[PDB]
Amino acid sequence: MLPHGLIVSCQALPDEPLHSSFIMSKMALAAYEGGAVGIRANTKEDILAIKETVDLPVIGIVKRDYDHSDVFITATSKEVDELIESQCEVIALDATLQQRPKETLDELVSYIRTHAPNVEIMADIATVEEAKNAARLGFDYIGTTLHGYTSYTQGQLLYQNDFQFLKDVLQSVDAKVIAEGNVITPDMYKRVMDLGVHCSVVGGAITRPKEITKRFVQIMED
Amino acid sequence: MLPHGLIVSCQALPDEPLHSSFIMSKMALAAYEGGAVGIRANTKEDILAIKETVDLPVIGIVKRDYDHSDVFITATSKEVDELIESQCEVIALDATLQQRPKETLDELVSYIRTHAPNVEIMADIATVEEAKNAARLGFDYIGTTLHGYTSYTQGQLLYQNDFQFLKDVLQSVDAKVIAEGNVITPDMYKRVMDLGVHCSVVGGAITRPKEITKRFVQIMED
Numbered sequence: 001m002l003p004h005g006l007i008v009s010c011q012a013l014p015d016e017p018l019h020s021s022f023i024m025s026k027m028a029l030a031a032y033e034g035g036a037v038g039i040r041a042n043t044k045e046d047i048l049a050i051k052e053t054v055d056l057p058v059i060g061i062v063k064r065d066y067d068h069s070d071v072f073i074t075a076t077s078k079e080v081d082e083l084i085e086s087q088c089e090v091i092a093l094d095a096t097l098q099q100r101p102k103e104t105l106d107e108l109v110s111y112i113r114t115h116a117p118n119v120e121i122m123a124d125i126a127t128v129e130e131a132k133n134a135a136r137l138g139f140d141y142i143g144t145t146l147h148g149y150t151s152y153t154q155g156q157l158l159y160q161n162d163f164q165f166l167k168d169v170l171q172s173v174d175a176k177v178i179a180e181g182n183v184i185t186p187d188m189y190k191r192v193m194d195l196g197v198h199c200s201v202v203g204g205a206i207t208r209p210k211e212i213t214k215r216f217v218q219i220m221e222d
Numbered sequence: 223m224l225p226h227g228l229i230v231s232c233q234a235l236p237d238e239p240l241h242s243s244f245i246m247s248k249m250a251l252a253a254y255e256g257g258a259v260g261i262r263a264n265t266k267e268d269i270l271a272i273k274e275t276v277d278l279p280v281i282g283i284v285k286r287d288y289d290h291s292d293v294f295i296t297a298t299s300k301e302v303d304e305l306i307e308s309q310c311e312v313i314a315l316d317a318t319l320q321q322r323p324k325e326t327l328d329e330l331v332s333y334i335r336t337h338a339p340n341v342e343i344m345a346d347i348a349t350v351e352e353a354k355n356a357a358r359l360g361f362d363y364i365g366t367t368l369h370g371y372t373s374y375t376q377g378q379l380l381y382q383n384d385f386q387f388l389k390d391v392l393q394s395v396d397a398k399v400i401a402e403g404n405v406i407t408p409d410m411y412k413r414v415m416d417l418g419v420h421c422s423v424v425g426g427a428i429t430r431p432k433e434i435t436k437r438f439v440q441i442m443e444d
């Protein structure tokens with residue numbers, strides 16, 4: 001299971017500066033040396049390289065675009081199969097009811113419980129009712145990952161109104177909740193932990209130097 | 223010359239997981255894409271790799287320990303020759319009063335002016351005394367890099383007492399002053415720019431994921 005603490009997302013998609021399974025394994029080692037107690041990573045090859053380098057538990061995804069779908073976080077059984085091969089401890093997937101290329105959300109959950117009974121699953125959601133649906137499906141973790149990143153949650157950000165969206169998710173499910181997406185500062189990490197999340201996932205504030213540089217430069221442009 | 227803005231320090235010493243000229247070149251590219259105006263980098267190999275990746279001005283150093291000296295930032299003519307071969311725009315050196323392994327600070331300044339007359343020089347200092355000595359020797363930039371990192375500045379940190387050390391350096395020299403070392407947050411960066419520094423160098427807060435991770439974890443331990 002994932003401990004209570006800081007999970008660091010070590011991702012760099014194609015054309016991002018640090019894109020490389022090797023570089024993400026070194027970002028994961030850096031995060032481990034700083035006190036991370038889990039890693040979130042994208043693709044079997046990045047997961048495998050990270051697991052060569054740290055024993056941390058890993059939340060695995062495969063981000064892969066499909067024609068005729070807006071679902072890109074572990075969209076089909078093809079991505080699930082790669083993640084079962086990677087032997088990541090947790091498989092995370094988009095848990096919205098948007099149109100998928102192949103299997104439905106219920107079919108993917110069933111598929112993982114059948115082909116990988118020892119792996120926990122994490123639901124990446126954007127709404128409270130998507131969080132409630134994920135808890136009913138038996139997800140082990142429910143993450144705020146897609147809040148503001150679907151066409152129906154545009155302009156919304158996790159920290160708005162003293163984390164009101166997160167408070168609503170925490171009130172609506174008894175499953176372990178993960179604060180993920182837009183946990184930008186240590187102050188925000190402390191706030192979401194004090195509100196009662198199981199753990200928090202921090203990517204851009206630790207492992208995306210372009211995004212941290214932008215927050216420095218932006219303080220001078222206001 | 224160095225513009226007015228954010229210089230990102232893209233360093234990873236041999237003990238650090240991200241040690242690599244390739245990885246530091248990608249840190250510099252990310253920094254460029256986020257709005258950095260320059261890069262600070264360590265060793266000829268890293269500087270050359272960065273200068274093939276971005277057109278930004280580079281502040282070059284060679285960190286190299288010597289027996290019988292506490293000076294480790296560009297300590298001798300050996301390091302200066304490596305930086306002249308690098309073609310970095312600015313050469314930075316320890317500009318403390320500490321005994322060096324070979325040439326004195328005054329001899330190394332004369333050496334650079336003779337053998338690299340088109341390069342600017344930057345003084346890494348620890349004290350107001352050392353800033354005034356650097357202005358005597360004609361340094362183009364004077365940075366606060368070593369403040370708190372010498373046996374005679376123990377417990378001192380740039381941000382203490384609302385940047386009183388930086389205010390004292392700014393009052394004591396006409397040269398271009400660089401806030402470098404323990405500029406940890408965009409709020410600090412804005413404060414030092416508001417106090418009248420020419421530019422600021424930020425390293426650990428952008429390009430050391432272990433150090434950023436530690437600030438997240440520490441918030442929960444306090």
Ligand SMILES: *[C][C@](*)([N]C(*)(*)(C(*)(*)([O])C(*)(*)([O])C(*)(*)(*)([C]O(*)P([O])(=O)O*)O*)C(*)(*)(*)=O)=O*
Pocket residue numbers: 009011040061145146149180181182183201202203204205
């Ligand atoms: C919306 C989306 N997010 C993915 C990822 O790129 C994010 O970086 C992580 C971590 O969030 P930040 O805001 O801490 O970077 O969720 C999800 O893995 O595609």
Ligand SMILES: *[C][C@](*)([N][C]([C]=O)[C@@](*)([O])C(*)(*)([O])C(*)(*)(O*)[C](*)O(*)P(*)(*)(*)([O])(O*)=O*)=O*
Pocket residue numbers: 231233283367368371402403404405406423424425426427
């Ligand atoms: C005192 C010391 N500093 C080095 C100087 O180049 C760098 O490691 C340091 O990262 C750099 O000066 C920027 O400082 P911050 O504190 O932002 O990392 O060895």
Ligand SMILES: [Cl-]
Pocket residue numbers: 016017018207208209210211252
């Ligand atoms: Cl980045």
Ligand SMILES: [Cl-]
Pocket residue numbers: 217226227228229257258259
């Ligand atoms: Cl800038």
Ligand SMILES: [Cl-]
Pocket residue numbers: 266267270271
């Ligand atoms: Cl080279």
Ligand SMILES: [Cl-]
Pocket residue numbers: 030238240429430431432433
């Ligand atoms: Cl690091």
